[PDB]
TrEMBL record:
<comment type="similarity">
    <text>Belongs to the DEAD box helicase family.</text>
</comment>
<feature type="domain" description="Helicase ATP-binding">
    <location>
        <begin position="52"/>
        <end position="229"/>
    </location>
</feature>
<feature type="domain" description="DEAD-box RNA helicase Q">
    <location>
        <begin position="21"/>
        <end position="49"/>
    </location>
</feature>
<feature type="short sequence motif" description="Q motif">
    <location>
        <begin position="21"/>
        <end position="49"/>
    </location>
</feature>
<protein>
    <recommendedName>
        <fullName>RNA helicase</fullName>
    </recommendedName>
</protein>
Length: 232
């Protein structure tokens, strides 16, 4: 009736030791951004305890973790909080999140909105399908944060609706799913062929439930001295 479930974790590789957290309070961030509690985040999930500090240190990351482990919050909290602490036609996202499906993309936009409550942050989403209101959302509050599928992003970029010349934070959610769906061309395009800030000017984070050879490569081509962490 009462026992502990053991969840395996491993997150070492470079200049990074036990810098983990246990409470969200262990972290410094805008009092309002503590919309985290209203979002029902009571404590840090394993992936968040090991990845948030790393992310907060401007480090790239290759995190293996499945859906339902707190992944989304892990990469939106540090980023959204940073953008809000600087508090505020073609759009120029400051952060980009790449998702496989419109479903994931919508869920991520929603969490971001939850975390953005009563903040100047403008979040936008773009995905294949039938919706030109995405065009207007993009024309409007040229979101500081964008959630999109690789193909539609490319369409919007090629149509000069969206520019990544100021995008310094990028996340590939469910990376394995995107390669399987055949998005590597788009991701390669978006990442290395779209004038997106490079080198120490960009922080790239990767999340995948699985770690195939292709994802091991993607990681080799795109992350820099990345921290590898796995949960489960």
């Amino acid at each position: 009736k009462y026992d502990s479930i053991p969840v395996s974790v491993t997150g070492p590789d470079y200049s990074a030791t036990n810098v983990i957290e246990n409470f969200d309070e262990l972290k410094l961030d805008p009092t309002i951004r503590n919309n985290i509690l209203l979002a029902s985040y009571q404590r840090p999930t394993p992936i968040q305890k090991n990845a948030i500090p790393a992310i907060l240190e401007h480090r790239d990351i290759m995190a293996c973790a499945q859906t339902g482990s707190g992944k989304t919050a892990a990469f939106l909290i540090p980023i959204i909080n940073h953008l809000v602490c600087q508090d505020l036609k073609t759009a120029y996202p400051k952060c980009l999140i790449l998702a496989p499906t419109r479903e994931l993309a919508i869920q991520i936009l929603s969490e971001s909105q939850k975390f953005s409550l009563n903040t100047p942050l403008r979040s936008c989403v773009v995905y294949g399908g039938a919706d030109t209101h995405s065009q207007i959302r993009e024309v409007q509050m040229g979101c500081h944060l964008l959630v999109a599928t690789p193909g539609r992003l490319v369409d919007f970029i090629e149509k000069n609706k969206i520019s990544l010349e100021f995008c310094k934070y990028i996340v590939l959610d469910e990376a394995d799913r995107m390669l399987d769906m055949g998005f590597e061309p788009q991701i390669r395009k978006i990442i290395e062929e779209s004038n997106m800030p490079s080198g120490i000017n960009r922080q790239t984070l990767m999340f995948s439930a699985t770690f195939p050879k292709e994802i091991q490569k993607l990681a080799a081509d795109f992350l820099y001295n990345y921290i590898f962490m796995t949960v489960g």
